Amino acid sequence: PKSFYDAVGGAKTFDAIVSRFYAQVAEDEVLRRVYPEDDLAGAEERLRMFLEQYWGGPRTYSEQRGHPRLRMRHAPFRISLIERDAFLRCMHTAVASIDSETLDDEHRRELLDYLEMAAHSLVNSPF
Amino acid sequence: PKSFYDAVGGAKTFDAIVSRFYAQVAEDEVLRRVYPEDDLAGAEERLRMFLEQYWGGPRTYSEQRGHPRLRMRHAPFRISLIERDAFLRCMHTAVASIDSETLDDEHRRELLDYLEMAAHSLVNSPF
Ligand code: HEM
Ligand code: HEM
Ligand SMILES: [C-]#N
Ligand SMILES: [C-]#N
């Protein structure tokens, strides 16, 4: 359980978190207006691959997508405080669906602190 | 009293390590987009000078560049865990290419531990 990725249960956990997140996005009145496709399967795959690589897992994200330029990839979309908050709600819901044996208090806090900081940093629009 | 630098084979060892590192960088989906495409020779040379000096070799780095100030020198770049991990991956490959006669287990571990700690200290961005 060296890497954060391995410590929290690896592929199975990230699939669990991101699938639950994207299931929430699908119903989300705020986020549905911003995610461009009806079929959110691609978006879910890419976010999952990114998070898996970020926390020390497989490098499939950069193999398929190249270098992470996260600001430029969000630039087409108007992400104001309102979208940021909806994103964080869906993530908090997804993370709360994971049990504490799998995701212990320390790793849970660390992941949540990361997602909070990252989402604030991606706000790119006043409205 | 023998320096780490001389113990590990001095200039030839550091040249091999940094040269191989830069060759891995060029094949790395993450890092090839980060290092300066038009300044790779000079960049390779600065890293070699730095490492040679850090480990007790020539102090040419400080004469030419002053105090390392690595945080400020990496400030122009968004280094997240993604870039940290890619750097260490490339560095691990370069270091592994050096034989254990030249670079024995004790010196190998000390070099790797340094690179690990230093790469972590240069993380400056969430993505
Ligand atoms: C701040 C609230 C956010 C909103 C509203 C948002 C929305 C979006 C949208 C609409 C896309 C394009 C979806 C598509 O491909 O069809 C996208 C892509 C992406 N997002 Fe977010 N996002 C947010 C925050 C984040 C955060 C915090 C992260 C990771 C830390 C993240 C990681 C990614 C990644 C990796 C992609 C795909 C990049 C690629 O093209 O490879 N996003 N996001
Ligand atoms: C953490 C991941 C890292 C990334 C993405 C990264 C990337 C870069 C880049 C793009 C440059 C500019 C190259 C140039 O034009 O000189 C640079 C410079 C440099 N890096 Fe790194 N680096 C990382 C870690 C490290 C580490 C761990 C060390 C310590 C061994 C280091 C030592 C240096 C030195 C000495 C320079 C040149 C400074 C100068 O201009 O005098 N870097 N780095
Ligand atoms: C972004 N999801
Ligand atoms: C820095 N290389």
From Swiss-Prot, chains A, B:
Q: Does the keyword Repressor apply?
A: no
**Annotated membrane topology:** Peripheral membrane protein
Residues noted as binding heme in the record, renumbered to the chain: 74
What about PTM? Contains L-DOPA (3',4'-dihydroxyphenylalanine).
**Pfam families the UniProt entry points to:** Bac_globin (PF01152)
Query: In which compartments does the protein localize?
Result: Cell membrane
Q: Name the coenzymes or cofactors required.
A: heme
Q: Which SUPFAM superfamilies match?
A: Globin-like (SSF46458)
Give the UniProt entry's GO cellular component terms.
plasma membrane
- Textual note on the cofactor: Binds 1 heme group per subunit.
Q: Which Gene3D superfamilies match?
A: Globins
Q: Which InterPro entries match?
A: GlbO/GLB3-like, Globin-like_sf, Globin/Proto, Globin_bac-like_CS, Hemoglobin_trunc
Molecular function (Gene Ontology), one example: metal ion binding
Family to which the UniProt record says this protein belongs? Belongs to the truncated hemoglobin family. Group II subfamily.
**Subunit field text:** Homododecamer.
Q: State its role.
A: When expressed in E.coli and M.smegmatis, HbO increases oxygen uptake. Membrane vesicles of E.coli carrying HbO show a respiration activity about twice that of membranes without HbO. HbO seems to interact with a terminal oxidase. Therefore, HbO could participate in oxygen/electron-transfer process, suggesting a function related to the facilitation of oxygen transfer during aerobic metabolism of M.tuberculosis.
Q: What is this protein called?
A: Group 2 truncated hemoglobin GlbO
